[PDB]
Amino acid sequence: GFKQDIATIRGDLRTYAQDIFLAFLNKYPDERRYFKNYVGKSDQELKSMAKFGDHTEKWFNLMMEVADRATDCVPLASDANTLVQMKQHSSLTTGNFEKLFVALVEYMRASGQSFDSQSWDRFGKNLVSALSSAGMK
Amino acid sequence: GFKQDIATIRGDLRTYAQDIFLAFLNKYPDERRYFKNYVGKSDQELKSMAKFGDHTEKWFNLMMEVADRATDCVPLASDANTLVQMKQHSSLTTGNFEKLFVALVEYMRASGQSFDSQSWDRFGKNLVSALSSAGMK
Ligand code: HEM
Numbered sequence: 001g002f003k004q005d006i007a008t009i010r011g012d013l014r015t016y017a018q019d020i021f022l023a024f025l026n027k028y029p030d031e032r033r034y035f036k037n038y039v040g041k042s043d044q045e046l047k048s049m050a051k052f053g054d055h056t057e058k059w060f061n062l063m064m065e066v067a068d069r070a071t072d073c074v075p076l077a078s079d080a081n082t083l084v085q086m087k088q089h090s091s092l093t094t095g096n097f098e099k100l101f102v103a104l105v106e107y108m109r110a111s112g113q114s115f116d117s118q119s120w121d122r123f124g125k126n127l128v129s130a131l132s133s134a135g136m137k
Numbered sequence: 138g139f140k141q142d143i144a145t146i147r148g149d150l151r152t153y154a155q156d157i158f159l160a161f162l163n164k165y166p167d168e169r170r171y172f173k174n175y176v177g178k179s180d181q182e183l184k185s186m187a188k189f190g191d192h193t194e195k196w197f198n199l200m201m202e203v204a205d206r207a208t209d210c211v212p213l214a215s216d217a218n219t220l221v222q223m224k225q226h227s228s229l230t231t232g233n234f235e236k237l238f239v240a241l242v243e244y245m246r247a248s249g250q251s252f253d254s255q256s257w258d259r260f261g262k263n264l265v266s267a268l269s270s271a272g273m274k
């Protein structure tokens with residue numbers, strides 16, 4: 001289930017984080033505009049950049065904490081507030097998060113690993129609801 | 138599901154409130170000691186007492202407000218806090234609430250009406266957790 005999936009991801013985090021983030025950027029290439037120096041590069045070029053794996057791991061480290069602090073796939077309001085108020089997220093709207101979770105769920109469904117993808121879809125829905133409640137446009 | 142159950146209950150709030158409250162007292166007769174004016178009175182006698190229908194409906198009204206405000210059966214901490222801080226609840230512990238939810242779920246399962254009983258159980262569990270976090274003993 002969802003709780004065990006958090007442990008699965010955490011056990012191989014850099015690999016999952018990079019592969020899910022790449023699935024996101026490839027499904028939605030114009031999302032690269034929110035980042036520096038990602039356009040014009042293949043997956044392997046991205047993975048060999050100095051900061052790519054590091055920043056995506058820090059991403060997913062926090063995502064897994066948000067998932068872990070949730071009850072029944074409902075994130076804490078304080079975690080949602082942190083995500084809204086982060087300077088690095090000042091250009092974002094809930095649509096960015098929605099697209100990330102569409103890609104995340106798709107990745108999980110296609111994976112060989114028994115992820116509980118329906119729970120991840122619910123968690124994404126609930127996180128987006130929480131971001132809205134916290135004042136993300 | 139849970140949302141429909143809120144509508145079902147709200148549709149005939151007085152009747153459901155009284156029925157469930159009596160089911161609670163019948164399963165856990167010692168809980169009547171918290172309601173000193175209900176000691177030694179038949180169900181019909183209780184129904185003749187203005188405050189029995191009034192307070193019981195108002196309790197279940199607040200229960201329905203808390204249920205409706207929940208996300209996936211996870212209640213707001215602010216709602217748990219309201220329940221803990223009520224002067225009328227100053228002598229209670231989380232065990233009293235646990236018993237209420239056991240009886241409510243039992244009532245739902247026994248009823249002809251088609252309730253999402255598993256969800257009310259989970260809501261009860263999540264509310265008890267939240268009561269404890271808000272300082273109920
Ligand atoms: C639950 C989902 C998300 C979490 C937990 C999260 C968390 C984080 C964290 C921890 C950082 C700091 C990384 C660092 O500087 O080392 C970060 C940076 C950043 N985030 Fe997010 N984020 C999420 C969703 C998103 C989405 C959906 C977007 C855009 C589509 C996004 C855009 C950015 C950008 C542009 C930065 C700074 C630039 C960069 O690190 O490359 N974030 N995020």
Ligand code: HEM
Pocket residue numbers: 168171172191192193195196197199200220225226229233234237
């Ligand atoms: C989620 C569950 C509960 C909710 C939403 C709730 C809500 C309320 C409300 C709104 C009142 C005010 C009634 C009024 O004065 O008009 C009340 C009173 C009261 N509650 Fe609760 N309550 C809950 C659980 C319990 C439990 C489990 C007990 C004890 C077993 C309890 C004992 C009392 C007592 C003794 C009063 C005052 C006397 C009375 O109104 O009959 N409550 N509650």
